[PDB]
Symmetry: C2
Subunit: 392 residues, 2 copies
């Protein structure tokens, strides 16, 4: 039984977040001057928005798991006597939303300072990380260090054994590639083009230094995008080498290997089109070919093995598995169809992120389609854990 | 314990109220011009602010009552199957505070509208009164219906039997004469003063006919002040008539008629000042006397019977009673020290809001001195019902 103080905190945070969003929308529509470049602001705050949203739906997921009766503490090897309820996740999400809204509003108005408007985002991300790395024995002194340990163990995956938590968190990271992409963008912007000992902050894009972060002449953007795929590929390879069972781990390695071919081919087509080479169209051709070969194959891995659906022993449960726990079948069907639709959109977003086509529109497309695969992951987790619980 | 939805609603409403208050303060500091008169607006919203503060303090009172272990249900003679915890009062107070802030902000800014400022208070108070008298079976139907029934019982006190709750709310209304005075000010302003078939709203007015609501006319200012005094007076007269006890029911007659004497002398003094007679200062002298015989008499009623301190069997509890249920006597000492200060100020406020003196500064004193008698009565309730429980 959660104390009422937690629920009161949840309500307080939700209300403050709601009004801050409303007033920030009003300030955006009214106070913003239209000539000044605005895109860097969204490219900076998109990561914060994505993380906050993901935390919220993770809380929803754990509440749903607890209500459905799926014993998840044992399969997560979590401590039964010390576990996090959804209310705490809601408080964390609300507090982060409050700080993000305040930071964006302060950047928007900027009454007075020494540096005009480019001081708040760094302090904001610093507050986030200091919350993450808090060494005191407070603020859920169990969850923070546990998450830090899991993150460090994932970051050095090829040496330690891989469990359920390891690959679960790795795949969750696989859907937040926009986080690290925007992080690298902010480093590149703040290190090379931005003059810290300067004023203003509306440098024209006609300048030669402009768009350097947008260009791929260094070639590290593709790598920084495909880190999670590499991590997952090497974890599944290590799992195979440990257990010596070829079929599942090799298929998983293939599914996670298609994406390096994706990004490498997209980058090569990009450099050949900017170089004006005569035969730039063939790499586009095999680009769509790899599109199909990756999408169709991640689809079959998702629907066949992950959820155990479309099985020939379905029986009376047509279009589902013989044994189910969630009573609403329409939720199953909607999840399948939406999963299919957004699977292609996810790799569309990857391609636009790593291709640098349509500078006017590509940023907008990435922005709109970023907060959708996170929703897909949220809905996916339900059925992944129900299947794993039934298998166990 | 209430369902967590209750606490969540309480937190949400409190947070939105805090954020609305702070943004209203910022807008007033920034947007408002100093030259333009603002006093009518604050005189309008004072009543709503006082009511909201009263509801909050009532919630705190009932929480403390339940915690201290006093059997308040029997003493109020309320049904045990339907009682309101502090959280319900908290959510109602937060809701009304939300609409109060929203209406004040709408009056303040008025970005796009047809009627600038002179419809919102009417709509707010109308919705409040409709909420009070909504005949449907929702939104705490029993509490509102019971309160309406007991209000009807109180307003016909000379005919109906008087009880504990009757005189309790009679006293609460006595300390809340400010809302009645402000309501009559609004009524006369809306009927005769304000310019209806015009625009903008408040405009500088220097004519003699302006400020008639600031004037006493003939008696329209004193009588509204002494409505609570007259009501409590006739309640005590009927009580004496039914039980036939001399001491308390006859001293309370002077208790509630001394304020009548004071307001009448205030009216005569203000009229003499308008006439400018030489003998006027004479009525000033007895004024102070008729000031004194009010406050120090009311005081000797409170500490001796209602709270019942200064008992001859005080013993170890210095200047207190021999039996105290509250843990610390520090609250008792604080109450005793604050009662004397706020009682005199209460009488001063009753004098000033009726004598129509100090035109440019008296209203400021009235505004600042309105929201403390509510706090005084909030302090009073604890000890009053505690002593009543001990008497029972």
């Amino acid at each position: 039984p959660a104390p009422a103080w937690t629920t009161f905190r949840v309500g307080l945070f939700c209300g403050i977040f709601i009004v801050l969003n409303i007033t920030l929308v009003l300030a955006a529509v009214f106070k913003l001057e239209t000539d000044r470049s605005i895109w860097p602001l969204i490219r900076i705050y998109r990561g914060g928005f994505l993380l906050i949203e993901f935390l919220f739906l993770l809380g929803i997921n754990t509440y749903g798991w607890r209500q459905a009766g799926v014993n998840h503490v044992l399969i997560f090897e979590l401590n039964p006597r010390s576990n996090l309820s959804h209310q705490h996740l809601f408080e964390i999400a609300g507090f982060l939303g409050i700080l993000w809204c305040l930071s964006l509003l302060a950047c928007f108005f900027a009454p007075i300072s020494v540096i005009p408007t480019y001081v708040y985002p760094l302090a904001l991300y610093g507050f986030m990380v200091f919350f993450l790395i808090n060494p005191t024995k407070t603020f859920y002194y169990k969850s923070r260090f546990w998450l830090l340990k899991l993150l460090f163990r994932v970051f050095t995956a090829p040496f330690h054994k891989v469990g359920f938590a390891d690959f679960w968190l790795a795949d969750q990271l696989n859907s937040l590639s926009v986080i690290l992409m925007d992080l690298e963008y902010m480093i590149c912007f703040y290190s090379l083009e931005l003059k810290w000992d300067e004023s203003k902050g509306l440098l024209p894009n006609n300048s030669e230094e402009s768009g350097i972060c947008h260009k791929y002449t260094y070639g590290v953007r593709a790598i920084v995008q495909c880190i999670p795929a590499w991590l997952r590929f090497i974890q599944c390879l290590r799992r195979y080498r440990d257990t010596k069972r070829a079929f599942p781990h090799l298929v998983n390695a293939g599914k996670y290997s298609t994406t390096f071919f994706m990004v490498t081919f997209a980058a090569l087509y990009s450099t050949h089109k900017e170089r004006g080479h005569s035969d730039t169209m063939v790499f586009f051709y095999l680009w769509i070919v790899f599109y199909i070969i990756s999408s169709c194959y991640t689809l079959i891995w998702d629907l066949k093995m992950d959820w155990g659906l479309f099985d020939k022993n379905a029986g009376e449960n047509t279009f589902l598995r013989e044994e189910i726990v969630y009573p609403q079948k329409a939720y199953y069907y909607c999840a399948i169809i939406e999963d299919v639709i957004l699977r292609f959109a996810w790799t569309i977003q990857i391609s636009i992120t790593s291709t640098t086509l349509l500078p006017h529109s590509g940023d907008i497309i990435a922005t709109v389609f970023a907060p959708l695969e996170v929703f897909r992951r949220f809905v996916w987790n339900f059925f992944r854990l129900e299947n794993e619980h039934l298998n166990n």
